[PDB]
Structures are given as C-alpha cells and as structure tokens.
Amino acid sequence: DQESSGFAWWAGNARLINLSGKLLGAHVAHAGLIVFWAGAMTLFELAHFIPEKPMYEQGLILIPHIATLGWGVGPGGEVVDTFPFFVVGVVHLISSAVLGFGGVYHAIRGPETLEEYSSFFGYDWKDKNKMTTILGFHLIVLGIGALLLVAKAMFFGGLYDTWAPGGGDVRVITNPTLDPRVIFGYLLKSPFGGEGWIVSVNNLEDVVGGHIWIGLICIAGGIWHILTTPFGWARRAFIWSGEAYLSYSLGALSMMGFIATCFVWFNNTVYPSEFYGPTGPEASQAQAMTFLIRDQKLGANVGSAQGPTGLGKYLMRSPTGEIIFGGETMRFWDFRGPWLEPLRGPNGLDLNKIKNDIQPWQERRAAEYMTHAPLGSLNSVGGVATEINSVNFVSPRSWLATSHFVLAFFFLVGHLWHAGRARAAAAGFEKGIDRESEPVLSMPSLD
Amino acid sequence: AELTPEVLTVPLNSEGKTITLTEKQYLEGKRLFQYACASCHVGGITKTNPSLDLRTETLALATPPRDNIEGLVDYMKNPTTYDGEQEIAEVHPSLRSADIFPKMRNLTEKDLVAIAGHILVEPKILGDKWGGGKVYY
Amino acid sequence: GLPWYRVHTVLINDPGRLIAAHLMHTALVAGWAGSMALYELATFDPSDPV
Amino acid sequence: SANLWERFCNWVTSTDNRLYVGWFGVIMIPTLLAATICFVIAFIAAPPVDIDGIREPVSGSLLYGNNIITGAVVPSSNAIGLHFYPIWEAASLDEWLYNGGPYQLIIFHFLLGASCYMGRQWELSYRLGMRPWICVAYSAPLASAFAVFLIYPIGQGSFSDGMPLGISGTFNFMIVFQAEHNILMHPFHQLGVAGVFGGALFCAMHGSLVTSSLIRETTETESANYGYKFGQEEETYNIVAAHGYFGRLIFQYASFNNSRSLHFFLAAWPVVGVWFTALGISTMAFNLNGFNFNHSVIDAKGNVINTWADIINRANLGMEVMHERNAHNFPLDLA
Amino acid sequence: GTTGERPFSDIITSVRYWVIHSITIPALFIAGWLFVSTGLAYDVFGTPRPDSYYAQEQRSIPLVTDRFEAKQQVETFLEQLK
Amino acid sequence: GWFDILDDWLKRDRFVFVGWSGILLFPCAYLALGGWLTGTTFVTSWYTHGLASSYLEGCNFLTVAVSTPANSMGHSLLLLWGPEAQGDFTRWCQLGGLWTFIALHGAFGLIGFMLRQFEIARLVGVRPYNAIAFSAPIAVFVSVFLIYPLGQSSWFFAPSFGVAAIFRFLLFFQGFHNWTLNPFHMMGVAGVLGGALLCAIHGATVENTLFQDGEGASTFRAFNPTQAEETYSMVTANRFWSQIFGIAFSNKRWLHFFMLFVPVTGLWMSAIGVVGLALNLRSYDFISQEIRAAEDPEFETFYTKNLLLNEGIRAWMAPQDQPHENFVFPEEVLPRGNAL
C-alpha cells in the first residue's frame, strides 16, 4: 500500500499521516512500550532494592515515585512493605501486553483507514470539530486523572509529607487549599531566585488543592470542546493540518520537560529528599550546618567568627538582612527544609537555637546530605571530578534532571522543525521553490 | 608485587598478638568498607571532620587504642571521641544505633572483623596515600 | 584586471624587468644590512665583553 | 488610509525592507539594542564587580586597567545568586555596578533577542517562499549561548557562575569548568569537537573540491571569480569531475555525487555535533560530569598504577585547589 | 560506475564465502585469544603482568635514565623481581 | 620501456587507486595505523612514563595511548636497530620506540597522501586546490609532533598518541605556556570555529533554498547528477541573508574559495604559535598588568585570576608528569587557596 512513492524510508512514519486506522495502531502500540517500561523497570528496581538502605543510593527513580504517594513507606521514609511496589510493577507489565495487542492489530490486520469502518472514530485533520472534540475527550480523561490523585491523598491513604509535624511520614490530606487567590497565585510568581513560580510549592495542601482545580478546569474545557468549534481568530491564527497539530504538542512537551527538570532539581516537597537525594542547595547548606555544628562543639563562637574575606566563616547576612550560612553557600540562602527549619527564626537562623537547640538527628541528617550531594560522573563515581573510585553513586536528582533537559531540548527543536514544515506545507512550498514562479524574482531590488 | 599473606598479617590485640586475614576477608572487607564507610571515609580520610583520619598511627594514639582488630571492632559497636571521654554512637554509625543507621543492621561480627582488617591492611599497601587527601591522589 | 595579489605576474616573461626588480630587492636586502649595522654600532656597548 | 494598523502590519512584515524587521524583530531589534549599548558602555567604563560575593571586586573594563584581551563584563554577584537584579532593585547605580548589575541586563536581553533572531530566520524564509529549517541550524549555536549563559547558572545556583563577557573571562570559565567537571573526559564535549573539527575539515573539503573543479571561462590573467554571474541558470562547476577526483582519492562509494545529499551532510554534521556540546554544558550543569577513571588500573598487590587519566587529575586538582582563593570556607566544593 | 573487482554484495552473499569464512574468521579470533591467554603477548611486548610493576617492598618506578645504556638498565630493572 | 609499463599498471583505474604515490603512502599509512593499534593494546609505558597505557594492562579506549620515549633518549630517532634498542624488539617497545615509529612513518604517510591528491588531480585533470588545502593539516602535525618537541629537551614532551594522553597536552599548554592567551592560537580557533560555521550555514542555506524538481517530499532523489540548472536558488539565498544578516554572498566561486581559505588559514596560524612555543617564546604575560599587580594588591582582572590557575596546574602536575626530574614538593610548598 505505502512505499517509496509516499515518503523516503527514513521518513516512513509520515506515510501514516493519512491512514487513521494504522496511525492508531502506532499510538496504541507505542502507549504499550511506555506501560511496558514503567512495569518492567519497577520490577527491575525492586529486584535489586535493598530495604535497609537509602533509595537514592540504589539508582531508583520509579519506586521513589510510588513512595511519595504513600505506598510501602512510613516514618521518615522507612520502607515497610515492598508489595505495593511489586504490584504497580506487575500490573503495568500486564496491561502492556493488552495495549501491545491492539497496537499490532490496528497496524497490520484491522482497517488501514477508519472513516468508513466507523465514522465516529475516523477523522479529518482539517475537521475543526472532530479535532476539538477528540481533544475534548482527552481533556476529560486527563481531568479525571488529576482527581485520581486527589482521591488517593484525601481518601485512600495520603501521600508522603516530609514536612510532617512529627517528622516525615505518610499523611492524609483533609484540607486542600481551594482558595483561587492562593492556588493561581503560584502562576504569578517570579521564576527567579526566591519567588520560584510553580517549583515553589512547599506543602501538600496546595498540591492536592491545586490538583482539584486542575481536575475540574480540565474536564470543564473537555466538555466545552466537545460542544463547540474554534472561533474566528482561533482559525485565522493557527494552521490546520496533521503536522501543525503535532508541532503544537511538541513545543508543549518541551516546555513541560524544562519545568520538570527544575522541579526534580529544586523542589523538596513533591520530590522527598528521603527517597531521592538531597537537593543541590540542600547539600551545600548541610556542609555549613555540619561544620558550624562541629567547630561550635570545639568552643568556637559561630556568631562572631570572621572568615578570610572578613565576611563571616559560619554566619553572614543576605542582601535583604536575613541571617544565613556563610561561605559559597550564600547563593543557596533560599533553601528551606524540614531538618533545617527548626533553627530558623523570624529573621533567619537564630543564634540561640543554633547555640543550644541543635538536635542529633539534625547533625547526622546534615552529615548524611553533605556526603550525598548531587555530584558524580557518567561512569557513576560520586563526588568531585578529582575524587577517587570507591563510592559508586550519582544522585537520582542528577539523572532525572539531565535526561529530561536533553529530551526537553531536542523536543523544542522537534517543535521548530515540524512547525516550520507545517507553515511551508500549508502555503505549499515545503518541497522547493517553483522554478517558474520564483517569488523573490517578483520583488523589487533592495540592493 | 602481590598481596601476600605476609601483608595480610595485622595486629589482633593490644598485647602484640596478631591475626592473618585471607584474600577472601580482605575483598569482603573492602566491599563492606564501601557499603558503609566510603560515603564519609573514602580513601582513609573523614569528610565530615578532616582532622581525624584512619592512618594506623592516628588510630594508635587514639584513646583507647584503635589500631588493632579488637579496637576498631569495639569502636564499630560503641564509638567514642579521640580521648574516649564521650560516646558518640548517636551521630556515628554503630551496632548500638543500627535503628538510626540502617546500613549497620545487616553487619554481623564476621563483617565487623573484615572492615577492621581492611583499615589496617590498606595503609600497608597504599602507604602515604591512605592517610592524606587530594595531595596524594 | 589583475587582482592585487597578482600584480607581480607582470614579469613572468620579461627577463629585463625581472632582473630590474630583483636588483631592487637585493638593493633593499643589502641596504637593510648596512643600516641595521649602523643601528647596532650606535647602541652597542663594548665596555665589557665578560 | 486603508487602516493604520493594517498598514503597520504590512510594513513590518514587508519583504521590501533593506533589513527584514519581522514580528519577532519587533522584540528582537529593541532587546538587542539594549544589550549592545549597555555592553559597549560596560566593557569600556564599568567599575569593579564583586563577582564572588566576597567583597573582592574584579575590574574588567578598559578605563579601569584592562585591555581588549583581558577586559570583560563581570557576572553578577554570588550574594545575588539567581535573584532578579534589575536597576530598579538597587538603592543606586553605584550599588548596581558593584554587584554586577549590567551582566544580567545584557545576558537576558541578548538571549531574548538571539532567540527572536532565530524566530526571524524562519519568518523571512516563510515570506520568501523558501523552505524553513535554516533557523534550526542556528539553533545549535544559540542553544550553546543559552547553556553557557543561563542553563549552567540555573543548575549551579548563581549567575556569578555563568561565562563572563570577555576573552580572558571565557578562558577562566573553561579552566575552572574542566577542574570541577572534567569536561575533556565527557562524551558530549568530544562529539562537540568532532563536529567543530569535522566542520572545519568538511568546510575545507567542499570549499576546495568545488573551487578546484570550476569550468573555465576566465583569462590567464583575470580573476577566476569573474567566471560567474549573479543569477545564472546552469552550474559554475563540474560536480561530476569533482566526484571523479574525490572518488579516486578514497574510493567511489565513499564519495558524494548528489549535491543535495552532500549539502545536507555539510549542515547536519556540525549542527548535530554542537547540539551535543551544548547538551554537555547543559548536562554538566547538574553535576553529571565526564568519566572518572581515577585509580582504575591497580596492580596485583593493590598499588595504584597511573594512566594518562591520572595525570589529567593532577592538572585538575591544581585548578580546583587554586580557583577562587578566598571564596571557600569548607572541605567540599558544593557550589 | 564499475571496475574489475567482484561486487562485495555478491561475495558477502555467496554460500562459498561463508563456507570459507565460518572457518577463517573464528580461526583468527581463537588465535589472538590464545596470544593473550597463554601469556605470550606479555613477553613479545615486555608488558608487565599484574604482579610485575614493583618489587614486593619497593614503591619506586623503573624509569630509564640514560639513552645508550638504556637496554642494559632495563634488564637490571627486571632483575629485582620486577 | 618497463617504466611506462610499471606506470601503466599503477595508474590503472582500480577500486582503490594505487598510483606512484601509493608506493610511499600505503606502506607508511598502514604501518602508522598499525603501530598505534598495536601499542594501544599490547605495549606499556611503564619504563617510559611509569604509566599503564594498553588494553592488556587494563586501559580503556580513552586512557590508552602510545606514549613518548623517556626524556633520557633525547631527540633520538630510536631506530629498532639503533644504539638504544640494539636490534632487540621487546626493548624497543619498552623504550617507546613505537612512538618515533608511528611519528616518522605517519609523517611520510601524510606526504604521500598529499602527493596522491596531486597525482590523482593531474590524471583526472582537475585543479589541485585539494592539495593546497591539505597543507594546513600537515603544518599542524609537523609543528606539533615534530618541530615542538625538537625545541624542547626531548620527544618526551611531544603529544603522546592517545585520547586522554592528548588532553594533558592541552592542560599542559595552558598551565605552562598559557597557550589560550596566544594571538596565533586565537586566530586558530577563529578559523576552525568559524570554519565549522561556514560548513553548517552554507549546508542549511542550500537545503532550504532548493527548487522543486520532484513530486516527493524527500527531495534527495530530485537531484540531477548530470549538471544543468543550479539545484538551489542562489538568487533567493542572497536576498535572504541580505535581509537577516545585512551581508550575503553572490558569487558561488568566491563563497567556495572562502570556505577553503578560512579553516586552512586558521590552522596555519595556530601552527606558527606552536613553532614559537618550541623555543618557549610564549605569550604568557602582559607586563603592564604584572607591574600594577605588584605595587597594587587590590587590582584584579580575569587575567591575573587565570595565572593563579596555571601556578596550581604546574605545581600539582609536574611531579608525576615529569618523572625524570625527581620532583619532591612538600605539602607546605604546594600553593592552595582557602579550605580547598
């Protein structure tokens, strides 16, 4: 049916731009690979998982995702039952076969097109209604999902809250922030130092709360699109074609890929340092903590200690007056964390609490996080590039953040590429300048 | 140029008596040393307090002496300060604090002897390297 | 006409002006030698060969 | 008036402008003028900047003892970190010039404009009926500036760690980088130099091959360039004679005969290679560094047998141990 | 577009080729393997075995210090059971 | 005459053109590549640099290398049958004889290859601008792998053949010669970086200014291997760049010569710079800068900063990088900042 007199081999999948049926097999077979991975990987992780040992020290990135949702963990992120892990893994692994079946089917047996074998499923790219409608369906499916989280947190068990009053623990959220002023407030937050935008969420109430809003707002728009057509501008602005739509979704993922990179790198809440490693700023803070704690025990007065530059070996002031840790760590004075908060006062680090309220669990927490900073090599050798082999480790936060920046990036290229093609495809010159009617040749010379 | 049993002969106790480890214990120790020490004691130093290293001489002038299997083993159960005038098991991994330092839970007396032996065998092989830091890398 | 970097090709087969140029070159090289010497003699200090 | 705004939009988008001020241009042209003007003034008269937040001002402007090679625009303070530092955030300009205020105003405006510059490289291509993707080639050099001016600082937690705006200031960025990340031993950087070396290589390849296989239409004493007229129908070189020669240099099937496949390769190679180098700096901005083969090969007794990988580590320690003299107070360099 | 040589494609596909190379290729492989595994390679290139970098006690390097009497000096380095 | 028959045979159009040049090229070119691949897996650098340098010892593709001879050898050609190795092969290997082997052989291999280009060009009847261009890579190899060490104490300070073994050559040049601050090196990079730009920019400009000569999207097939019309709109390209950059080509003959010039001129300059580094006649410092830095302790530029980095590189590397000097630098003499 389709061969070289369509597209070139290395552009094969573009021969499916107008074969709805087969183009469904791909998406159903593909969606299988994602489920397959998630499942097959979880079991791989668990197969190697050692209970009495930090998750971040075992190269896990899925089991800690489950742990966060309050599953198989307890006090301080202690692993209680590995069954929920095994379950989530096997379930997925199975569904991958189910999806995979349909994929293979729709791509090599079933109808090569849909329009006739059912007008409901068949579609036309330029059919502004079918598009807004299918989009509308998905906008609901995603919307229900957003609530599927709100349910698990409020009814079915909770989530892992590191900020837990009694110290990190699975907690049931029964008071989601629904106040729009607060919720949507985050979006009006700066993305720079301090005000951190979305990544600045620091409590489960907002998380759960925000998700309620999204769940609703999403399904609302899901119905709206089912029951409508793009307006006037909406039509005279965009390009309506199979590629153009892709592109739009490409730039969308890209952007989400960058946001994800910063979330796993900066956020403490939705990415617990107990399961992942300590955040970048958290580890550098911990060093200051560790040594202020040490030397203070040796009889040094941290409050008045003067370092080489005359700035304050252990404690100094931020640009706005607050008391912070000294050293190169002055750049991370925006770090907040369970272990360090009890030492903060209304003006920043309180010289009195620091002087006699430091608790042992904090001293060893700081030591732990200090010796587990997100520094490592490709071949997985934890530490600074000049370190020696022995401690095989690279923070999960480092792995996640890098992988997702690469992906996010290439996707922005993917966007540009498919968007540039769509605009040329539309207007109709994505295959060369018309030898005869060469546009430039009809324009006056600027010379 | 090899790890002869001559090199694996390290002091067992304070009263001069020695013990001879085997290439199996060594490797095993080395593995355990990575599992629960390297994190902070990579290459014989101490990241969270660079003033105290694992040099045999340093362990010799410790109090009590920790430059022998018996010593180091005791330490790994009930750790103390360099003068021994204070127990630090709360902020240092040890058997009496495995609840706080999970990595120490598995560890059995067999394992403790290996780790201790490793600490006394390394400087014998590496020499100055074991004690010092980046200067010797 | 001729590009700037080819102006001297005007001699490729004019033995006369080829000798005439080259004579000028030698003059410059001989000239430089003579005068570079004088520069050194006007600044060299013989007061101590050690 | 057919309608002012309607006209405005027709002028902006007009393909009859000497310089195509596009829609992206409307954002580009102003941002780039701010960046350049501030730069030029900074580089010449700006006062010392306390880059390391340790009250140890580094002067990098001409009027303050610098020359072209040493002079630079110094990065914002480390005390500021990633905080936004616009002029209206300072008690005075004096304070703003001391904390490296100019640096941010420049990097932000440049990166902004340089992006729209890409957006424009699409727009004009659209308005002229030519295929897009040219802007996609320019995505590689841009993605580097981004990596070096924004990605690395975000990752490292401060803009003071971004590459300075100067010759020597750049060498500093490199030497230190190498020490903290061992970049030479990282796959992405290697692909980068492959793309750059390769580029220059191929650039010489094509360049030579083509110019060497030009059809004669010029005199013996007339520039071989004149043998081409702007707006020709047929080709100006024998691409079949070129391939004939190059095919014999190596071997036939290892030679291009399709000008289109040739030129795609010519573009694909460097762009792909630089894309990876940019991803290298952007990846090592989260401390996923190059291979660490320190003390890998050891002998039968346990002795450490050095490799060239170790000799590199010493050179690295020197940089580490000496960079930012007075900025460190603790053992590990985690910032 | 052609020269005397028999088009690779044909050869890499000829059952004759494989009947030959199924023998030849692995032959060379097992040979080279043996070259290393029999310790011969170590002697052909004077390359030290894991237990021949230093003498038991010594921690010094056998650095060749003079050109003309180098070979002689090298031999002496092998003497101290290095 | 046999000669013309010998010729006849050589210049015969085969799959892999031999030619007169081949009599020099292939022997060397193969021995060079062979010697590397050999040493890379079998020969050690223990007796030469106190370094493991082959797979057989445990080195990987990055850490492997054919290291230079000892510093004792001096500039000795180190012939297998020379006073050093004395006909012995194993010794030759341990004395880094394989370096001068690869070096000297490969050197001739590059002569042969350019000659080939020259010879094949002549036959095919095309201009030798491929040969002129290849002078740049020669200059580099000659100046760096020969001229440079010839000015130093010995071959020992020439770049060792290997991946990592080249990275230290870079770091060395920074630390000791402050090479990055050299006007000629800069021109060098300007050519290579700028050359890798012309490559990319011209390629993309062509692919996106093509005429339509087919009905498919994959426009590759749509090309006429047998000349005729320009396959891309040279007229459109001109207008494009003339509006986005302000400047634009308009003479493919010049545009292509430029592409030869830029990277070849670049590499030539970077060579001159190294030829000077042989005599150690480097571009290390700026005197006006040093004098003010001496008298005034508060004067600090990104230049002064760099020099301190060099001091560290030299002090911390020199010991294991120059074994023959039996360096011993007590911990207290080692320059170091605070804490680190």
Ligand code: CLA
């Ligand atoms: C991307 C998802 C997807 C889509 C859009 C389709 C679409 C289609 N499939 Mg199908 N298929 C899929 C996945 C999908 N399939 C998978 C994973 C498999 C493997 C099991 C199959 C196996 C399959 C077969 C064997 C056949 C089809 C056929 C068809 C076509 C006829 C419609 C039909 O089967 O009605 C079915 C009737 C329904 C409308 C009822 C489905 C209700 C189910 C039971 C509930 C689903 C629950 C859901 C997961 C959760 C959503 C709820 C949430 C919103 C709250 C149609 C184009 C037929 C065809 O080729 O005809 C042309 C056909 O023979 N499919």
Ligand code: CLA
């Ligand atoms: C995400 C991965 C993916 C997917 C889902 C598809 C899917 C598809 N491609 Mg495709 N493609 C891909 C990657 C992918 N491609 C890549 C990377 C390339 C570049 C190499 C191509 C190049 C390419 C070309 C050049 C063409 C396609 C075509 C097609 C379509 C027809 C399938 C076909 O020809 O059957 C052929 C059937 C076989 C030879 C049998 C293959 C074996 C099956 C499919 C795998 C079984 C999976 C598993 C082992 C069994 C599970 C069973 C279990 C559930 C019980 C189909 C929609 C064609 C098209 O355009 O449609 C008309 C087409 O011409 N593709």
Ligand code: CLA
């Ligand atoms: C992208 C998301 C992602 C992330 C963040 C991770 C992260 C991690 N994985 Mg992982 N993994 C993933 C996807 C991911 N994986 C997938 C899709 C698979 C299926 C193949 C696996 C299979 C897998 C296994 C089997 C294992 C891990 C392990 C690990 C952990 C150790 C990391 C490692 O050692 O890296 C080292 C890997 C690299 C250095 C390879 C880099 C490859 C890059 C991307 C190539 C780029 C070249 C480029 C594409 C060329 C194209 C150019 C050309 C077109 C011109 C780490 C937490 C290990 C673990 O859990 O042990 C603790 C482990 O055993 N993973």
Ligand code: CLA
């Ligand atoms: C992700 C799923 C999704 C998708 C793909 C769409 C897609 C679409 N919607 Mg839509 N919609 C959704 C969800 C979605 N919607 C939801 C959940 C709701 C309920 C709130 C709506 C409510 C909605 C309405 C009420 C309308 C649409 C319309 C449209 C169409 C035109 C939109 C447009 O022109 O934007 C382009 C918009 C601009 C010109 C303004 C850009 C300014 C942006 C918003 C701010 C800058 C963005 C910035 C970079 C991000 C920073 C974050 C910020 C918070 C600081 C388009 C097909 C319109 C339509 O045609 O209806 C049929 C329309 O009237 N939608």
Ligand code: CLA
């Ligand atoms: C043995 C000495 C020598 C001689 C006699 C020639 C002679 C010639 N060369 Mg030439 N050439 C030489 C060495 C020499 N070259 C070297 C060493 C190189 C490599 C660097 C070249 C590279 C070269 C090229 C690339 C070309 C020639 C060309 C020519 C011919 C035209 C000359 C022309 O008009 O220049 C014009 C001269 C000027 C208007 C510009 C001179 C500007 C210089 C660079 C500034 C330095 C001036 C300074 C005083 C020089 C000090 C001398 C120093 C050696 C001590 C001419 C026959 C050209 C030719 O073939 O035309 C078809 C041509 O294209 N030569």
Ligand code: CLA
């Ligand atoms: C009347 C003849 C004459 C005499 C006697 C001298 C004498 C002298 N000149 Mg001189 N000179 C002359 C003409 C003369 N010059 C001319 C015409 C010029 C312009 C071209 C110069 C330009 C000149 C300069 C620029 C310099 C001198 C210098 C000197 C002095 C140093 C001599 C030196 O070491 O030479 C060195 C001799 C050689 C370069 C060796 C030449 C051998 C070549 C390499 C072989 C050529 C290849 C050959 C054809 C192969 C065939 C040989 C066959 C037998 C196998 C010396 C006093 C130097 C001085 O100190 O300043 C005052 C100096 O710098 N001269």
Ligand code: CLA
């Ligand atoms: C034709 C290509 C070629 C070339 C140019 C070279 C060149 C070289 N090889 Mg070589 N080599 C080649 C092929 C080639 N090789 C091949 C195919 C092999 C594998 C068998 C080798 C194996 C090899 C080894 C193992 C070594 C070299 C070495 C060398 C270098 C020094 C050797 C020397 O002193 O030559 C001397 C030059 C001659 C013998 C030419 C003499 C020609 C005249 C006309 C003949 C006169 C003969 C007559 C008896 C003399 C009468 C005079 C009377 C007074 C006695 C030199 C660069 C050595 C080296 O790399 O050291 C670092 C080295 O050890 N090569």
Ligand SMILES: [Cl-]
């Ligand atoms: Cl510095």
Ligand SMILES: [Fe+2]
């Ligand atoms: Fe071209």
